[PDB]
């Protein structure tokens, strides 16, 4: 009777047991029918679908296959015996939350459940209840100002530019450099290069000048066939897209500006706390040097006297899940679960409290 925590992302599913310091099951949010890694390997005879797009569940039959694979194949637990905490994207439509609740109680027969906003869990993971979260994963990036556990709806910013977009861009600039990555197998390799050799430059223009004059910024990545992939400015030009979305033809402002615009859409009286509590969350915030860059970009945009602070935990690839593990195992939260009796009697709309 230990609570389960399932954090469903656009690209990855993070599942585990409330109380653990990390999720035991992490696998691709893909359905081929095959789910996860099995579908990724046997892709030739199968067509792969992502049931979650830009953090929103858009395919319920496939999403059901993913929860089934999570409970029985990966965690090998009986859903009927465990309160289950799920996560959702900010601004998730009401109809989505109800469908999520209906499937958990009618298809998996959970005894209790809860739906928490992903960014809010990240804030908790860092011991905070007020602050602004930069949550960037594989499909979507969000700026979420939070006041004592409540996400300020009018200040939430959504940006459809995340890890997958940076992977596509890396594939393109690598080809413009001489290498050629087209097949999907070559995409999984480029994704691995991105996560292993990429970083955010403090000064992009100067880094570009430094890369063109010397080879000190060059790193090598060897493929199994013996080919050595050496890259210079591609290391920082890829994640630079976060601050200059125009690199991939997007008119939106960088993540530093969406953070500022979000803070400016909040009451002037809460901006001070937000500036001092920038929590970075998601796999796309793992690039070395991103924290120092945000510190610099935000300082240039905020009042000169403003105290800026960027919090980038080393475990931010799973901050959402960690925050949920903490939440669901606290004693003060045990009376916040939606019970089966409430659902059995009032139905799926009971999720709106």
């Amino acid at each position: 009777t230990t609570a389960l925590v399932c954090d469903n992302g656009s690209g990855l599913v993070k599942a585990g047991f409330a109380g653990d310091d990390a999720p035991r099951a992490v696998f691709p949010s893909i359905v081929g029918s095959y789910v996860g890694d099995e579908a990724q390997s046997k892709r030739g005879i199968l067509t792969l679908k992502y049931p979650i797009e830009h953090g929103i569940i858009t395919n319920w039959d496939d999403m059901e296959k993913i929860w089934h694979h999570t409970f029985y194949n990966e965690l090998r637990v009986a859903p009927e015996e465990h309160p289950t905490l799920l996560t959702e994207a900010p601004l998730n439509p009401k109809a989505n939350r109800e469908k999520m609740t209906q499937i958990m109680f009618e298809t998996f027969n959970v005894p209790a459940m809860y739906v928490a906003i992903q960014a809010v869990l990240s804030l908790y993971a860092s011991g905070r209840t007020t602050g602004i979260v930069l949550d960037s994963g594989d499909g979507v990036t969000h700026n979420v100002p939070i006041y004592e556990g409540y996400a300020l709806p009018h200040a939430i910013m959504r940006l459809d530019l995340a890890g997958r977009d940076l992977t596509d861009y890396l594939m393109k600039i690598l080809t413009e450099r001489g290498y050629s990555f087209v097949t999907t197998a070559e995409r999984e390799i480029v994704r691995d290069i991105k996560e292993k050799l990429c970083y955010v430059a403090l000064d992009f223009e100067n880094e570009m000048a430094t890369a063109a004059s010397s080879s000190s910024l060059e790193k090598s990545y060897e493929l199994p066939d013996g080919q050595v992939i050496t890259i210079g400015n591609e290391r920082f030009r890829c994640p630079e897209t976060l601050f200059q979305p125009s690199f991939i033809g997007m008119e939106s402002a960088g993540i530093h500006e969406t953070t500022y615009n979000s803070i400016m859409k909040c009451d002037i009286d809460i901006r001070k706390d937000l500036y001092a509590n920038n929590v970075m969350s998601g796999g796309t915030t793992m690039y070395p040097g991103i924290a120092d860059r945000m510190q610099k970009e935000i300082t240039a945009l905020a009042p000169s006297t403003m105290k800026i602070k960027i919090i980038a935990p080393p475990e931010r690839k799973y901050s959402v899940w960690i925050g949920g593990s903490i939440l669901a195992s606290l004693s003060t939260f045990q009376q916040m679960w939606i019970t089966k009796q409430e659902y059995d009697e009032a139905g799926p709309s009971i999720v709106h409290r």
Binding site: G19, D20, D21, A22, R24, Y124, A125, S126, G127, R128, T129, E148, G149, E315, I322, S325, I326, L327, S329, L330, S331, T332, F333, Q335, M336
Partner: peptide, 22 residues
């Protein structure tokens, strides 16, 4: 209020340090 109590728990929870290592 439990909400104030919940906010208190998160601040005094200790974070990831109080979770079982896997």
């Amino acid at each position: 209020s439990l909400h104030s109590a919940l906010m208190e728990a998160i601040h005094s929870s200790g974070g990831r340090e109080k979770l079982r290592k896997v």
